[PDB]
């Protein structure tokens, strides 16, 4: 049952793209709950975590997305970015974000391609 | 004039790129620059409307709701996105809601000036 979660993630993309906030809260949480059970290391799990964390961060809920991205910052670059921005907003856990973002920078330096919305280059 | 249009287009792509990421102050400055540059061009041309809409969106995004509300109130009828920004500001401040209603009712009833555009956050 991956078509339904793909459709709902695309729906989340469309909703957040329409500058609609707290609409993506329910759908992001639905994706989080659905994908927490199927796997803990699949690409869909990381995608759901990242979309959820984006939804909480953009809806003035920082003290939750903070820890949510803290748990799985090392899996996806967008999760680490959300963690760092929420750390800047809340002035907490700066060092861990520094280490994670330094590590992703060295990966580019040393001799990741998800195209989801609001993903920084 | 040959390069004048290219600069405006490049600036528009720059603002869309900046808004796409969570980079808002740069979007603020770039939208301000485009809005200032577009002053010479006549109100009939689309570019003024797109620049005003982008500036209003950037002002709304930066929590400066009052300035976005005023700017959108100035040219609310020209573009649909300006009306959207007016409605968002009206809900956020509860000021001038009646004008927002008289604009949105007309824009919704007519659909079902400039109505469609390729820019970011163009409402459906």
How far apart CA A112 and CA A93 sit, in angstroms, is: 23
User: What resolution (Å)?
Assistant: 3.5
For residue A85, which residues of chain B lie inside 8 Å, CB to CB? Answer: 22
C-alpha closest to that of A75 among A108, A103, A37, A117:
A103
Residues in chain B closer than 8 A to A17 (CB atoms): 120-121
Cβ atoms within 10 Å, residue A104:
16
**Count of residues in chain B:** 124
CA dihedral B124, B50, B118, B10 (to 10 degrees): -150
| Nearest Cα to Cα of residue A50 among A80, A12, A79, A9 | A79
Q: State the Cα–Cα distance between residues B97 and B105, nearest whole angstrom.
A: 12
- The sign of the dihedral angle between the CA atoms of B78, B72, B27, A46 is negative
d(CA B116, CA B102) in angstroms, rounded, equals 20
Instruction: Tell whether the torsion through CA atoms of B19, B21, B24 and B26 is positive or negative.
Output: negative
- Dihedral, CA of residue B95, residue B101, residue B104 and residue B106, to nearest 10: -140
Q: DSSP string of chain B?
A: -TTHHHHHHHHHHHHHHHHHTT--HHHHHHHHHHHHHTTSS-TTSHHHHHHHHHHHHHHHHTT-HHHHHHHHHHTTTTBHHHHHHHHHHHHHH--SHHHHHHHHHHHHHHH--B---SSTT---
Residue B57: both structure tokens together: 């969106």
The answer for residues whose C-beta is within 8 angstroms of residue B106's C-beta and 6 or more apart is none
CA A8, A12, A17: angle at the middle one, nearest 5?
150
∠ at Cα B7 (B86, B46), nearest 5°?
A: 40
B26 shares contact with chain A (CB less than 8 Å): no
CA-based end-to-end distance of chain B: 34
Most distant CA atoms of chain B, gap in Å:
45
Contact B21 A85 (CB under 8 A): no
Is residue A2 within a helix (H) or strand (E), and if so which, with residue range? Answer: none
Cβ-based contacts of B22 with chain A (< 8 Å): 85, 118, 120
Look at B121 and A18 and tell me if their CB atoms are within 8 Å: yes
- Helix, strand, or coil (residue A118): coil
User: For the CA atoms of chain B, what is the radius of gyration?
Assistant: 14
Distance of CA B9 to the CA centre of its chain: 15
| Residue in B closest to A14 by C-alpha | B121
Answer for the pair B80, B123: CB distance below 8 angstroms, yes or no: yes
Q: Which token pair is B19?
A: 């808004």
Q: Where are the alpha helices (DSSP H) in A39-76?
A: 43-58, 62-71
Contact partners, residue A114, CB within 8 Å, separation at least 6? A47, A50, A76, A77, A78
B79: β partners: B114
CA angle, B38 then B41 then B42, to 5°: 125
Q: How far does Cα B21 stand from its chain's mean position?
A: 18
Contacting residues for A106 by C-beta, under 8 A, at least 6 apart: none
Let me know how many helices (H) and strands (E) chain A has, helices first.
6, 0
The verdict on a CB contact (< 8 Å) between A118 and B124 is no
B-chain CB neighbours of A121 within 8 Å are 21
Q: Is residue A113 within 8 Å of residue A9, measured between CB atoms?
A: no
| Of B60, B57, B67, B69, the residue nearest B120 (C-alpha) | B57
Residue B24, class by beta-carbon neighbours within 10 Å (0-12 exposed, 13-18 middle, 19+ buried)?
Answer: middle
Looking at the complex, report in whole angstroms how far the Cα of residue B19 sits from the nearest Cα belonging to chain A. 9
């Amino acid at each position: 049952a991956l078509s339904t979660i793909i459709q709902l993630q695309d729906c989340i993309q469309q909703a957040i793209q329409q500058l609609n906030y707290s609409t993506a809260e329910f759908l992001a949480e639905l994706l989080y709950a659905e994908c927490s059970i199927l796997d803990k290391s699949s690409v869909y799990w990381s995608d759901a975590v990242y979309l959820y964390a984006l939804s909480l961060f953009l809806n003035k809920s920082y003290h939750t997305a903070f820890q949510i991205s803290k748990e799985f910052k090392e899996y996806h670059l967008g999760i680490a970015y959300i963690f760092g921005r929420c750390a800047l907003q809340l002035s907490q856990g700066v060092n861990e974000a520094i280490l994670t973002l330094l590590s992703i920078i060295n990966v580019f330096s040393s001799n990741l391609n998800s195209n989801l919305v609001h993903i920084p280059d | 004039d040959d390069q004048a249009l290219s600069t405006i287009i490049q600036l528009q792509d720059c603002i869309q790129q900046a808004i796409q990421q969570l980079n808002y102050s740069t979007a603020e400055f770039l939208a301000e620059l485009l809005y200032a540059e577009c002053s010479i061009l006549d109100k009939s041309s689309v570019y003024w409307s797109d620049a005003v809409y982008l500036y209003a969106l950037s002002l709304f995004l930066n929590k400066s709701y009052h300035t976005a509300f005023q700017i959108s109130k100035e040219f609310k009828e020209y573009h649909l996105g300006i009306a959207y920004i007016f409605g968002r500001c009206a809900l956020q401040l509860s000021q001038g809601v009646n004008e927002a209603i008289l604009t949105l009712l007309s824009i919704i009833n007519v659909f079902s000036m400039v109505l469609n555009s390729n820019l970011v956050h163009i409402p459906d």
